[PDB]
Amino acid sequence: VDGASVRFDSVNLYATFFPMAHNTASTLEAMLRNDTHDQSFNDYLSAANM
Amino acid sequence: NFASLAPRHGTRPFMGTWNEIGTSQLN
Amino acid sequence: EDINFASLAPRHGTRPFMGTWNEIGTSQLN
Amino acid sequence: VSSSIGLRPDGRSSFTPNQAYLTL
């Protein structure tokens, strides 16, 4: 009602990679591409809010 | 094979500790 | 396997109700 | 009429190993 609001001017995405030898990054990528093992996470709260 | 990636604490690599786990819920 | 896949064709009864040849694209103001 | 070929090669998905080529 009284105060003003924020005003975005520019947004950028930053991302830092671990500098890893291409010899072993290909191997790690080869493993993670396998069907047997894939990342799996669960919400910490893990609840259905009503 | 992959022991060459681990820091060496002497003549042996610093490996072990099968704690590749995750269990995080409010419970 | 080398099975052959036909098309589903929403059914009016047992028959698949394919339809007629209506691939016509002639407008031609004339 | 039959104009197709369901050749199995035995993107992908983890829950099933079944894929299928189609020849036209």
Q: If contacts are CB pairs under 8 Å, which of residues 1-24 in chain D contact chain A? A: 12, 14, 17
Asked if residue B9 lies in contact with residue B16, where contact means CB atoms within 8 angstroms, the answer is no
3-state secondary structure of B25: coil
Give CA–CA dist B6/B10, Å, rounded: 12
Resolution (A): 3.4
* CB within 8 Å of C10: residues ≥ 6 apart: C16, C17
DSSP string covering C1-30: --B--------SSSS---------------
Give CA–CA dist A28/A30, Å, rounded: 5
HSE-CB of B5 using CA atoms within 13 angstroms: 9
**Per this entry, what is the length of chain A?**
50
The β-bridge partners of D13 are: D16
Nearest CA in chain A to D14: A35
Cα angle value B9/B10/B12 (rounded, 5°): 80
CB contact under 8 A, D4 and C1: no
C to D CB pairs, distance under 8 Å: 20
Cα angle value C23/C26/C28 (rounded, 5°): 175
| Experimentally determined by | cryo-EM
Give CA–CA dist B3/A24, Å, rounded: 12
